[PDB]
């Protein structure tokens, strides 16, 4: 297909949030960019940063909003317009509370799972019909509010597994791109 594909990883800006649960999308987007030797650059027409390349013979545009998670959509929308990418050809990688820690699933449309970033994207795109690479982080402990949970770094136990989980998520994204 000649149509461009837009892979978006979701996450908050700053070192304080780089290793948090809510930033898995950013981690996978970097992995993907590293894999195809592409480097992220400022995109002033959207405000996000972009990295370009090719996968499975397809034109690929990787992106990470530079604003806060709750405002992700306002950067992704203008980004899709710039590359004329239809919502359906947009793939967003995100952490998911409704899936067990480490479980990766694919899906087009459906709910936001309580993710404030997805909520933002759906609003900006005017639809829920965009692809998603869901990366399970598990339900939050009863002692913590869900918003606080996603803004914490993974436990030492989980941390040991995060690296392979991201490789798997990056792999699932590539397979998705191919099929």
Backbone as a ProteinNet text record, in pm:
[ID]
protein_1_A
[PRIMARY]
XXXXXXXXXXXXXXXXXXXXXXXXXXXXXXXXXXXXXXXXXXXXXXXXXXXXXXXXXXXXXXXXXXXXXXXXXXXXXXXXXXXXXXXXXXXXXXXXXXXXXXXXXXXXXXXXXXXXXXXXXXXXXXXXXXXXXXXXXXXXXXXXXXXXXXXXXXXXXXXXXXXXXXXXXXXXXXXXXXX
[TERTIARY]
85.6	0	87.7	41.2	116.3	80.5	-32.5	-79.4	20.4	45.6	139.9	79	164.3	121.3	179.8	98.5	145	140.9	258.9	269.6	295.3	205.7	218.9	234	335.9	356.1	307.4	235.6	185.5	269.9	278.4	356.7	370.2	412.8	432.6	576.3	600.8	736.3	821.3	952.9	1041.3	1101.9	1216.9	1286.5	1203.2	1130.7	1048	946.8	903.3	804.8	855.8	982.4	1041.6	1026.6	1038.9	1027.7	896	797.7	668.2	582	478.4	387.9	316.8	272.5	200.8	289.1	418.9	509.9	558.5	495.9	538.9	537.1	434.4	423.5	548.1	601.5	721.5	840	849.8	958.4	958.1	840	827.2	850.2	804.5	823.9	974.4	1049.1	1193.9	1259.1	1215.4	1265.4	1244.9	1122.9	1091.3	1180.5	1198.3	1281.9	1426.6	1472.6	1608	1621.7	1527.2	1528.8	1548.1	1473.1	1491.3	1582.5	1678.9	1775.4	1724.6	1599.9	1542.4	1556.7	1561.6	1575.3	1464	1410	1302.4	1345	1264.2	1289.5	1163.7	1181.5	1068.7	981.4	850.4	754.5	674.6	709.5	642.4	499.8	454.8	318.1	223.2	279.4	199.2	245.7	376.1	430.6	492	458.7	514.3	647.8	714	839.5	819.9	880	863.2	992.3	979.3	1089.4	1032.8	1102.4	1050.9	1136.3	1071.4	1140.8	1047.8	1088.6	1005.9	1006.5	889.3	874.6	779.4	822.7	741.7	704.4	795.6	771.7	672.5	641.7	547.4	616.5	564.4	618.8	575.3	670.3	641.3	672.2	577.8	598.7	574.2	681.5	673.8	658.7	581.3	560.5	537.4	576.2	558.2	517.5	398.8	356.1	458.8	471.4	566.4	497	364.3	282.3	246.8	167.1	127.7	26.3	25.9	-62	-206.2	-264.3	-402.9	-429.9	-323.5	-333.9	-277.1	-240.2	-182.7	-255.7	-388	-469.4	-449.1	-431.5	-414.2	-285.7	-194.8	-72.2	-81.1	-144.8	-159.6	-251.9	-361.2	-454.6	-386.8	-323.8	-255.5	-144.2	-90.5	16.4	-41.9	-157	-222.2	-259.9	-304.3	-343.8	-224.8	-111	10.5	51.9	42.4	79.1	-42.1	-158	-279.2	-295.2	-290.4	-306.5	-447.6	-521.9	-658.1	-650.4	-745.5	-746.9	-717.5	-777.1	-758.9	-612.9	-532	-391	-302.8	-367.3	-296.7	-293.5	-174	-153.2	-94.6	-166.8	-111.1	-80.4	42.4	94.7	72.1	6.9	-21.1	-25.4	-4.6	-10.4	-159.7	-194.6	-335.7	-364.4	-449.2	-488	-580.1	-650.1	-743.1	-678.9	-546.6	-474.1	-368.1	-346.4	-246.7	-109.7	-27.2	107.8	181	225.7	299.3	220	87.9	6.5	-16.6	15.3	0.2	-115.1	-203.3	-316.2	-337.6	-393.3	-419	-568.3	-604.7	-745.3	-770.3	-883.1	-919.5	-1049.2	-1050.1	-1169.5	-1187.8	-1310.2	-1333.9	-1317.6	-1319.7	-1306.9	-1165.3	-1153.4	-1024.4	-959.5	-1034.9	-980.4	-943.8	-1001.9	-973.7	-844.4	-780.8	-655.4	-683.5	-635.3	-659.8	-598.1	-492.3	-428.1	-513.8	-567	-652.6	-777.3	-828.8	-947	-919.8	-802.3	-758.9	-748.2	-688.7	-672.5	-807.4	-898.2	-1030.4	-1101.2	-1088	-1150.8	-1094	-961.6	-894.1	-919.2	-933.3	-955.9	-1103.8	-1191.3	-1333.9	-1384.2	-1300.4	-1339.2	-1252.6	-1302.8	-1230.1	-1163.8	-1200.5	-1147.6	-1004.1	-910.9	-768.7	-711.9	-608.2	-546.5	-477.2	-466.4	-400.3	-318.2	-198.7	-114.1	-123.6	-201.5	-226.2	-122.4	-53.1	49.3	6.1	-34.3	-79.9	13.6	-39.2	39.5	-30.3	-143.8	-219.9	-305.2	-401.1	-489	-409	-454.8	-383	-412.1	-318.4	-340.8	-458.2	-540.3	-653.4	-614.1	-492.9	-444.1	-405.7	-403.1	-364.5	-466.9	-477.7	-569.1	-503.9	-584.6	-533.6	-442	-474.1	-393.2	-255.6	-251	-123.8	-44.1	-113.6	-51.6	27.6	-35.4	31.6	147.3	152.8	261.1	379.2	376.5	485.4	574.5	699.6	791.1	746.1	782.8	746.7	825.9	772.4	841.5	969.4	1062.2	1186	1155	1056.8	1015.8	973.7	879.9	829.2	937.4	1017.8	1124.1	1206.2	1235.2	1314.6	1249.9	1117.4	1043.3	1010.2	1005.7	971.9	1050.1	1183.1	1259.7	1214.1	1190.6	1147.9	1005.1	922.7	783.9	779.7	869.5	873.4	922.9	1014	1063.4	944.6	867.7	751.6	648.5	629.1	533.1	579.5	709.8	764.4	745.9	766.3	749	603.5	510.6	368.7	330.5	397.2	368.1	415.3	532.1	586	498.1	453.4	368.3	237.3	186.8	63.1	81.5	195.9	229	234.6	292.5	304.7	171.9	80.6	-49.3	-165.6
-121.9	0	124.9	230	354.6	448.3	421.2	503.2	501.9	618.8	626.6	570.8	518.4	463.4	551.3	584	666.4	586.9	560	486.5	589.4	595.3	691.5	623.2	664.1	609.8	717.7	680.6	780.4	786.1	905.3	923.2	1068.4	1089.1	1223.7	1267.4	1399.4	1450.4	1458.1	1465.6	1477	1347.7	1359.9	1244.5	1179.2	1260.3	1207.7	1103.2	1110.8	1015.6	913	924.1	834.2	684.9	645.9	504.8	463.3	552.7	522.2	433.3	375.6	284.5	349.5	472.7	548.8	587.4	559.3	593.4	476.1	359.1	244.5	274	346.1	379.8	450.8	540.2	615.6	521.3	428.8	332.3	245.4	199.8	114.9	193.8	319.1	403.3	427.2	439.4	459.8	331.5	217.9	87.7	74.7	102.2	93.4	185.1	309.2	405.8	356.4	302.3	250.1	138.4	44.5	-68.3	-25.7	74	117.7	239.6	249.8	358.6	499.2	527.2	660.2	741.5	873.6	962.2	1067.1	1089	1185.3	1330.5	1406.6	1547.8	1628.5	1754.8	1841.8	1859	1852.7	1870	1993.4	2108.8	2233	2251.6	2164.9	2174.2	2103	2023.8	1950.1	1972.6	1992.4	2012.5	1884.7	1771.3	1644.3	1625	1513.7	1486.2	1361.7	1362.1	1252.3	1183.6	1055.9	972.4	895.9	897.4	827.4	710.5	615.6	498.5	405.8	280.4	184.5	45.8	-16.5	-149	-233.7	-355.5	-446.5	-380.2	-298.4	-230	-115.1	-71.9	37.7	163.7	279	406.6	419.2	447.7	456	590.9	641.7	766.8	741.8	745.5	723.6	858.9	863.7	990.3	980.2	1086.4	1098.3	1242.4	1263.4	1400.3	1460.4	1592.6	1655.7	1726.4	1726.8	1788.5	1679.6	1714.1	1615.5	1515.6	1396.6	1287.8	1327.6	1410	1453.6	1537	1592	1676.2	1609.6	1482.2	1408.8	1428.9	1417.4	1433	1561.5	1674.3	1800.1	1808.9	1713.1	1712.5	1604.3	1492.9	1380.5	1413.8	1484	1521.1	1599.7	1712.7	1794.3	1715.8	1616.4	1534.8	1445.4	1385.5	1299	1379.2	1503.1	1588.7	1618.1	1649.5	1680.1	1565.6	1442.1	1326.2	1262.7	1326.1	1272.8	1125.2	1093.5	956.2	940.7	846	820.7	757.7	790.8	735.4	584.8	510.8	366.1	323.8	411.1	380.3	435.6	475.8	526.2	414.3	387.1	284.6	349.4	345.4	403.9	296.9	304.4	212.9	273.4	197.8	248.5	140.2	182.6	93.3	66.4	-51.2	-84.5	-150.2	-84.9	-133.7	-255.4	-275	-386.9	-518.4	-519.7	-639.9	-673.2	-802.5	-846.1	-793.1	-767.9	-717.8	-800.9	-734.9	-803	-859.2	-866.5	-918.8	-812.2	-846.9	-754.4	-797.1	-703.1	-732.7	-620.6	-656	-560	-532.2	-415	-381	-253.5	-250.1	-133.1	-83	42.8	98.2	42.7	46.5	-3.1	110.2	77.9	180.3	226.3	328.3	385.2	315.8	229.4	160	255.6	374.8	473	549.6	528.3	596	739.1	838.1	977.6	1019.2	949.7	981.1	936.4	815	759.5	845.2	886.3	970	1094.7	1153.6	1272.7	1247.3	1134.5	1098.6	1079.4	1008.4	983.8	1116.2	1210.1	1341.1	1417	1415.9	1485.9	1422.4	1290.4	1221.9	1211	1243.2	1236.3	1094.1	998.1	857.7	769	649.4	552.8	452.3	458.4	365	384.3	375.6	383.1	259.6	200.3	79.8	107	4.4	18.9	-104.2	-81.1	-189.9	-172.3	-259.8	-256	-335.5	-268.2	-332.5	-337.8	-456.2	-472.8	-433.5	-358.7	-318.3	-369.3	-435.1	-489.8	-386.5	-433.9	-345	-277.4	-160.3	-89.6	-151.9	-138.8	-195	-116.8	-181.8	-112.1	10.7	9.7	119.8	245.4	236.9	352.1	390.8	520.5	568.8	529.3	493.1	453.1	556.4	684.3	790.2	793.8	771.4	772.5	648.3	536.2	409.3	419.5	471.9	482.8	581.8	672.4	770.1	724.2	598.5	543.6	456.5	438.2	352.3	210.4	114.5	-24.3	-72.6	-171.5	-226.2	-295.2	-324.1	-390.9	-524	-594.8	-722.7	-705.6	-614.3	-589	-533.4	-441.4	-379.5	-482.7	-594.4	-701.2	-756.7	-748.7	-799.3	-694	-567.4	-459.8	-458.5	-477.1	-476.1	-576.5	-701.5	-801.7	-774.3	-723	-689.1	-582.1	-484.4	-378.9	-431.8	-528.7	-587.5	-660	-731	-803.4	-705.9	-592.7	-492.9	-431.7	-407.6	-352.2	-456.5	-583.8	-692.7	-700.2	-689.3	-696.1	-580.4	-466.5	-350.3	-376	-437.5	-468	-569.9	-672.3	-774	-709.2	-616.8	-544.8	-464.9	-397.3	-317.2	-405.5	-524.5	-618.9	-676.7	-700.8	-757.5	-659
0	0	0	-66.6	-73.9	40.9	105.8	217.3	332.7	392.7	504.8	633.9	721.1	849	959.3	1059.2	1170.2	1300.6	1355.3	1480.4	1589.1	1687.2	1795.5	1931	2005.7	2138.7	2233.4	2339.8	2433.7	2560.9	2619.8	2741.1	2785.1	2909.4	2963.5	2937.4	2930	2905.1	3031.1	3013.5	3128	3179.2	3244.8	3300.7	3410.9	3487.6	3595.9	3550.9	3425.7	3377.1	3276.3	3237.2	3138.1	3166.4	3292.7	3327.3	3392.2	3392.4	3452.8	3363.6	3423.8	3354.9	3237.3	3258	3157	3038.5	3047.6	2938.8	2853	2866.9	2786.8	2636.6	2590.7	2449.7	2399.3	2481.8	2447.1	2435.8	2530.6	2531.3	2405.8	2364.7	2246.3	2118.1	2116.3	1999.2	1979.1	2088.4	2077.3	2025.5	2079.1	2036.4	1885.8	1840.5	1698.7	1615.3	1661.5	1590.5	1587.1	1699.1	1706.5	1604	1606.7	1514.4	1369.2	1322.9	1185	1171.5	1262.9	1262.5	1235.4	1272.4	1252.6	1380.9	1367.1	1482	1487.1	1606.5	1626	1612.4	1539.5	1516.8	1543.5	1580.9	1609.1	1484.3	1503.6	1394.5	1435.8	1380.2	1418.7	1369.5	1279.5	1228.8	1326.5	1418	1516.2	1659.7	1676.8	1809.6	1864	1803.5	1848.6	1779.2	1807.3	1739.8	1654.5	1536.5	1444.1	1401.2	1366.4	1319	1199.1	1085.7	967.9	919.3	852.3	801.2	725.1	707.1	634.4	698.3	702.7	761.4	677.6	645	564.8	431.7	380.1	254.4	263.4	385.5	406.4	457	415.9	460.5	606.2	694.4	836.8	901.6	980	1052.1	1200.5	1278.8	1423	1491.4	1599.1	1667.5	1817.5	1887.2	2031.1	2059	2117.4	2147.9	2245.1	2247.3	2337.6	2452.6	2447.5	2550.2	2650.5	2751	2850.3	2795.7	2855.2	2813.9	2782.7	2868.9	2853.4	2729.3	2672	2553.1	2427.2	2437.8	2325.1	2193.3	2198.4	2079.1	2001.2	2069.5	1997.4	1914.6	1932.4	1853.5	1746.1	1781.1	1689.6	1572.7	1601.2	1496.2	1385.7	1419.5	1318.5	1249.6	1319.5	1263.9	1154.8	1183.6	1086.2	961.8	982.2	870.4	780.3	841.7	767.6	675.3	724.2	643.5	577.3	591	530.6	563.5	692.1	736.4	790.7	734.9	779.6	918.1	1006.7	1142.6	1146.2	1052.7	1045.2	1026.2	967	944.7	1056.2	1165.4	1282.6	1386.9	1437.9	1539.1	1664.4	1775.7	1896.3	2001.1	2050.9	2150.4	2288.5	2376.3	2509.7	2616.2	2740.4	2855.2	2875.9	2927.1	2947.1	3082.2	3161.2	3293.6	3290.9	3179.4	3167.6	3124.5	3113	3073.1	3176.7	3199.3	3295.5	3256.3	3357.2	3336.7	3231.8	3125.2	3019.9	2903	2915.9	2806.9	2700.2	2576.3	2464.4	2373.9	2340	2251.9	2150.8	2035.4	1928.8	1920	1870	1862.5	1783.5	1713.7	1635.9	1696.3	1738.4	1799.3	1939.3	1989.9	2124.5	2223.8	2352.8	2455.2	2484.2	2569.3	2608	2727.6	2794.7	2910	3022.1	3019.5	3122.8	3101.3	2986.5	2954.8	2908	2982.9	2946.9	2812.9	2771.1	2644.7	2527.5	2536.7	2432.3	2419.7	2534.7	2539.8	2455.2	2475.7	2403.7	2252.8	2215.4	2074.7	2004.5	2069.8	2013.3	1985.3	2077.9	2063.6	1944.5	1932.2	1823.8	1687.3	1683.7	1556.8	1519.5	1614.1	1588.2	1578.7	1617.5	1612.8	1701.1	1729.8	1810.4	1716.5	1589	1490.9	1442.2	1536.5	1506.6	1575.7	1517.2	1572.9	1706.6	1790.4	1919.7	1955.9	2009	2056.4	2208.2	2270.9	2414.4	2493.3	2584.9	2667.3	2813.9	2859.1	2996.2	3109.5	3206	3322.4	3447.8	3426.8	3537.4	3607.5	3686.5	3761.4	3871.7	3917.1	4023	4159.6	4254.6	4388.1	4447.9	4529.9	4589.3	4670.5	4724.3	4806.6	4729.1	4596.6	4515.8	4411.7	4385.9	4283.6	4151.1	4050.4	3918.4	3851.9	3868	3808.5	3873.4	4004.2	4074.7	4034.2	4019.2	3981	3851	3746.5	3617.1	3613.9	3711.4	3714.7	3800.1	3843.7	3924.1	3836.2	3877.5	3804.2	3835.8	3751.5	3778.3	3899.2	3970.1	4086.2	4039.1	4131.8	4090.3	4022.5	4077	4021.7	3876.3	3853	3718.5	3626.5	3678.8	3600.7	3525.7	3591.5	3531.4	3404.5	3397.5	3282.8	3176.8	3216.5	3123.5	2991.2	2996.1	2871.2	2765.3	2804.4	2707.1	2660.2	2751.3	2720.9	2611	2619.3	2518.8	2384.8	2387.8	2263.7	2198	2279.7	2229.7	2172.6	2240	2193.8	2062.3	2050.9	1928.5	1818.2	1852.5	1756.3	1709.4	1803.8	1770.6	1679.3	1696.8	1614.7	1472.1	1459.8	1328.5	1257.2	1329.2	1267.8	1222.9	1304.4	1273.7	1144.7	1134.5	1017.1	892.5	907.9	797.4	753.7	847.4	810.6	832.7
[MASK]
+++++++++++++++++++++++++++++++++++++++++++++++++++++++++++++++++++++++++++++++++++++++++++++++++++++++++++++++++++++++++++++++++++++++++++++++++++++++++++++++++++++++++++++++++++

